[PDB]
Design a protein around this ligand. Sequence first.
Ligand SMILES: [Cu+2]
Ligand SMILES: [Cu+2]
Ligand code: NI
Length: 305
Amino acid sequence: TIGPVTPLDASDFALDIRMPGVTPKESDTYFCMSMRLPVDEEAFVIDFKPRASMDTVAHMLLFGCNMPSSTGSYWFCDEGTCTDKANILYAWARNAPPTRLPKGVGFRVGGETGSKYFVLQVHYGDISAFRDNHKDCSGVSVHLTRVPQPLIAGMYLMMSVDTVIPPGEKVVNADISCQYKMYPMHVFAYRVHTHHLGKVVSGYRVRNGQWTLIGRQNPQLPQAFYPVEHPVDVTFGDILAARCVFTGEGRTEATHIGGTSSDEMCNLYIMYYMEAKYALSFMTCTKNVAPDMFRTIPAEANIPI
Ligand SMILES: [Cu+2]
Ligand SMILES: [Cu+2]
Ligand code: NI
């Protein structure tokens, strides 16, 4: 080994979270493994270094989850592994170099209310190179500290629950909105998720009837975290709003929200930071509290990228 925990700086350490020498049989194999945080006190994730085999690795995801495993182990996993409401800490996709965390920012783990386990999912797409039966140890090295950080990263997940897409309908809009009523968050990156019917997903902060884009992306592109130009402050009274556009073309019956590939999802993951003393690591919106606000949604919410 050397070990999974290594020192760095004065009072920091690194957790190498790798696959334990896997060799996948079929292509488009999803493997998971997990590791425990080696301290029980409050600590902060302040960086991620991808250690991926450009050969065969399509994507990696790191979740703050709560799935203990034996130190050798790995297993077949799918999208729902850490639920509905998965706390993604890091995504990596081939051909979408991800973005660093902003200076002073880290994810708050351990303690009485943080994650004690990290779960890593690695997608092996093209398995040409396992012709030869070598073991792959792809993954992420995570820079941890016990030194309090002034800014705390979190995730605001917007998702639709009761959308229905009729067969052959060229356009169905799944709309999501909630008023924001916390201390200020600063949005710096976003990720979108639909299945194959999704055409475009967009999210906005609306303040005083004025729409500010957070992000807009094709969900059929690599589902990584994309940066936000300038961060968007969201603040008490603001409304977060999102629209996924679906088509029914090429379907025979209606499509509902669900986990399988013949079902659909509309998820927008908004990654933010907050000042340490007011911070929440996770918020959720599953409602549409301001449906009529969508009269003024920019037209490009309905235009595929
Ligand atoms: Cu993938
Ligand atoms: Cu899904
Ligand atoms: Ni600025």
